[PDB]
Amino acid sequence: DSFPPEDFGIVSGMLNVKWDRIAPASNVSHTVVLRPLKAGYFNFTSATITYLAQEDGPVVIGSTSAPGQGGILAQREFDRRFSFLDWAAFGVMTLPSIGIPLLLWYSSKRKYD
Amino acid sequence: TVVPPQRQATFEYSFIPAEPMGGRPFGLVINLNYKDLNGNVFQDAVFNQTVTDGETIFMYMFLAGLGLLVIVGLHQLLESRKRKRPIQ
Amino acid sequence: GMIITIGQSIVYVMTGMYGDPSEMGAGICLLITIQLFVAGLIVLLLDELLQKGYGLGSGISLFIATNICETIVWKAFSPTTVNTGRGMEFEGAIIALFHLLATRTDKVRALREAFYRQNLPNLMNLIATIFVFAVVIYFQGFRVDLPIKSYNTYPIKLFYTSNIPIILQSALVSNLYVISQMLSLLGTWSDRAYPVGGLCYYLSPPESFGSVLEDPVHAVVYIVFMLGSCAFFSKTWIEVSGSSAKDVAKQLKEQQMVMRGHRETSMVHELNRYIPTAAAFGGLCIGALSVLADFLGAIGSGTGILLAVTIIYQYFEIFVKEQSEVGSM
Amino acid sequence: AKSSALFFGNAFIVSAIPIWLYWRIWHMDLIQSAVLYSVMTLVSTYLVAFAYKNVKFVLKHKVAQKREDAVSKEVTRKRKEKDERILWKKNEVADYEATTFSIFYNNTLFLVVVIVASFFILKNFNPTVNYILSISASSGLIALLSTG
Amino acid sequence: MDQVMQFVEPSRQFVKDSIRLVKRCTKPDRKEFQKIAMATAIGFAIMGFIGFFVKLIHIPINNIIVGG
Numbered sequence: 001d002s003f004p005p006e007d008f009g010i011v012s013g014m015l016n017v018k019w020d021r022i023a024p025a026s027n028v029s030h031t032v033v034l035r036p037l038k039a040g041y042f043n044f045t046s047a048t049i050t051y052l053a054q055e056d057g058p059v060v061i062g063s064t065s066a067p068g069q070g071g072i073l074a075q076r077e078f079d080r081r082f083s084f085l086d087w088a089a090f091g092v093m094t095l096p097s098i099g100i101p102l103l104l105w106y107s108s109k110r111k112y113d
Numbered sequence: 114t115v116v117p118p119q120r121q122a123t124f125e126y127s128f129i130p131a132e133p134m135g136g137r138p139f140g141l142v143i144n145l146n147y148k149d150l151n152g153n154v155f156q157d158a159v160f161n162q163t164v165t166d167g168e169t170i171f172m173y174m175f176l177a178g179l180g181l182l183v184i185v186g187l188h189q190l191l192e193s194r195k196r197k198r199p200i201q
Numbered sequence: 202g203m204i205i206t207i208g209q210s211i212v213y214v215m216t217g218m219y220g221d222p223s224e225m226g227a228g229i230c231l232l233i234t235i236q237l238f239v240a241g242l243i244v245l246l247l248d249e250l251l252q253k254g255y256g257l258g259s260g261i262s263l264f265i266a267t268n269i270c271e272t273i274v275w276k277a278f279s280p281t282t283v284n285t286g287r288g289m290e291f292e293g294a295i296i297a298l299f300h301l302l303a304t305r306t307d308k309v310r311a312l313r314e315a316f317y318r319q320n321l322p323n324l325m326n327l328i329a330t331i332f333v334f335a336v337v338i339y340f341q342g343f344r345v346d347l348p349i350k351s352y353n354t355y356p357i358k359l360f361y362t363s364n365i366p367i368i369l370q371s372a373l374v375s376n377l378y379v380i381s382q383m384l385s386l387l388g389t390w391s392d393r394a395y396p397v398g399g400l401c402y403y404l405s406p407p408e409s410f411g412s413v414l415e416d417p418v419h420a421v422v423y424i425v426f427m428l429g430s431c432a433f434f435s436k437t438w439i440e441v442s443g444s445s446a447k448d449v450a451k452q453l454k455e456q457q458m459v460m461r462g463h464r465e466t467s468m469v470h471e472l473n474r475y476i477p478t479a480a481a482f483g484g485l486c487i488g489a490l491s492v493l494a495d496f497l498g499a500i501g502s503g504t505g506i507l508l509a510v511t512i513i514y515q516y517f518e519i520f521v522k523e524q525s526e527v528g529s530m
Numbered sequence: 531a532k533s534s535a536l537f538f539g540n541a542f543i544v545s546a547i548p549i550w551l552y553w554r555i556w557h558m559d560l561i562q563s564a565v566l567y568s569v570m571t572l573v574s575t576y577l578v579a580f581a582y583k584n585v586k587f588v589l590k591h592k593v594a595q596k597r598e599d600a601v602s603k604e605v606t607r608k609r610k611e612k613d614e615r616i617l618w619k620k621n622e623v624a625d626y627e628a629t630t631f632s633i634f635y636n637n638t639l640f641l642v643v644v645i646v647a648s649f650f651i652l653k654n655f656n657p658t659v660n661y662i663l664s665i666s667a668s669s670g671l672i673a674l675l676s677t678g
Numbered sequence: 679m680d681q682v683m684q685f686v687e688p689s690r691q692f693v694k695d696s697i698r699l700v701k702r703c704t705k706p707d708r709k710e711f712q713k714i715a716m717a718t719a720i721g722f723a724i725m726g727f728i729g730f731f732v733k734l735i736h737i738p739i740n741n742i743i744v745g746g
Contacts, residue, residue, distance in 0.1 A: 344704065513721055
């Protein structure tokens with residue numbers, strides 16, 4: 001429940017999932033894709049896990065690891081730090097500054113050299 | 114992290130054995146330090162067992178055989194001169 | 202000197218460089234007195250006998266050079282035992298090979314051993330050292346000459362400019378570093394202590410290859426003062442040598458010796474061209490060599506080789522004269 | 531001298547080009563930063579046009595020194611009645627290419643200065659500081675270089 | 679401009695005239711270098727060899743106090 005829907009959109013996966021059985025010496029992997037809606041520091045707290053250790057046994061409550069406090073970068077700040085194609089488009093934009101003299105200089109030289 | 118009674122927690126830890134530790138046996142000790150609400154400190158040795166650049170190759174071992182190319186050239190231009198003491 | 206040594210000896214006895222200042226016994230103060238007084242004075246009178254030509258000149262030079270011979274080359278072959286915390290290892294880096302061969306099939310790893318050992322370090326440092334040792338003889342043997350008149354010539358001394366400075370150049374930096382550490386933005390230090398912050402850290406010598414890999418930009422700052430002192434602050438050694446134009450001129454007038462071609466008197470202006478220019482490759486590049494070696498890691502050599510092998514040269518030309526007496530006879 | 535209008539029509543161009551990448555990778559605020567942009571472009575156009583004139587004026591003579599023999603050859607191949615063609619055409623013949631190279635070199639010089647400052651020195655600095663120092667240093671240094 | 683050059687002129691003259699002088703002055707010596715070459719290593723090694731053996735008396739004599 002650590003991810004309120006007002007701050008994180010669920011894109012894929014579930015914050016709540018149940019499995020009928022996990023065999024001994026077996027494992028299950030679950031993946032959730034969220035989308036943070038606001039930049040800032042967020043605390044990735046542990047999730048809660050409940051299970052029965054034996055049939056008709058007491059419910060055992062466990063917790064996952066906590067990744068801890070992570071920074072959600074603002075999209076503008078991410079782009080400022082890691083923004084490719086900008087140079088691809090920029091390269092051509094610089095050419096026109098010297099179009100006239102570049103051609104004329106050599107044309108005159110050839111006419112006199 | 115507070116662990117209430119009859120609950121469990123799980124912690125991920127990761128470390129990197131130093132590069133010079135290749136080929137050696139070491140005692141790996143992993144301790145978990147925890148205390149009660151009364152302030153009694155407890156420690157559990159959860160694990161206490163004995164657990165068992167290409168520039169390096171380029172920058173001489175490879176290139177020595179190219180220094181030898183200089184040698185083969187100059188040894189030609191030196192030792193080919195040894196054709197001037199036959200006898201009549 | 203004698204009294205300055207005694208003063209130093211008393212200062213560290215008062216410090217108790219080893220031992221609490223009374224409980225081991227005051228008689229060790231007498232012991233240290235006799236020890237150092239005798240040792241130093243005898244050593245000096247050795248150097249005097251040599252300069253008196255029962256030897257050749259300076260002994261102390263040759264002595265420290267021999268110490269350098271040991272402290273370098275001993276580590277090549279000394280079969281004395283070392284332990285990592287693995288078991289039986291050897292000091293003499295090279296010969297370990299023969300026991301590794303009996304230990305492992307892993308020839309490639311046996312060779313990488315030549316590149317690994319971090320303490321009493323691996324052979325690759327020795328190999329660099331050897332290469333430096335070999336190369337320098339090229340530079341030092343060069344010399345230049347002028348005709349002299351009452352078929353004879355004065356050899357213009359060349360690397361004589363290199364002989365004196367580097368001692369001072371290294372010392373001044375090392376000492377100001379030590380001072381700043383003791384007195385304390387200027388500088389902050391990690392554990393051999395080393396700088397890790399302040400100007401002194403931007404100033405610090407990037408001896409580690411790791412320092413190369415982490416940041417090249419830093420190294421310029423170290424170069425700027427370390428080399429620039431050789432470029433400019435050295436210039437004053439005309440007085441230290443006592444060899445400005447109007448000094449060398451005086452010396453040669455005491456010699457009463459004159460060149461061909463132009464006047465004794467204008468010979469000041471004649472020799473001026475040669476006098477400042479001697480300071481260039483005659484001196485500064487020996488520092489550049491020193492730093493080359495040191496950052497390549499040539500063991501203790503960027504001090505040692507410079508003097509030691511020059512002394513080997515001097516001893517060689519002496520050996521030539523005498524033994525060539527044998528060879529001619 | 532009145533030809534300086536062309537210099538004014540040329541010196542401003544390069545001063546403003548980097549705005550694209552600055553808005554794309556440095557994400558500069560074009561509204562707030564317009565204060566800096568206007569001043570930078572105006573100063574650059576002023577001194578750079580003055581440099582254009584200085585470079586061409588200082589070097590135009592060499593063009594005639596080199597090729598005036600050829601230009602005379604073609605002039606005649608086409609003394610008072612003969613010299614008039616020299617004043618009408620030859621002087622401009624040297625001038626024309628002298629200007630073209632002067633402007634060409636000045637513009638070629640400008641690019642590297644900004645590239646080095648922004649993407650090799652001011653990498654570790656605020657985009658505001660990045661643009662300020664990069665462009666201001668480029669303009670001042672390049673104009674001083676032209677006076678060299 | 680030239681007043682700015684004044685800073686350059688000492689650097690240029692000292693470097694360039696120094697190199698001219700050096701090469702005009704100290705012409706190569708390679709063959710006699712070959713004559714000294716072997717003796718360089720021989721003398722280096724044999725004079726080091728002095729201490730390389732003299733050390734061997736002292737390590738175990740240190741046992742008189744230390745190696746207990």
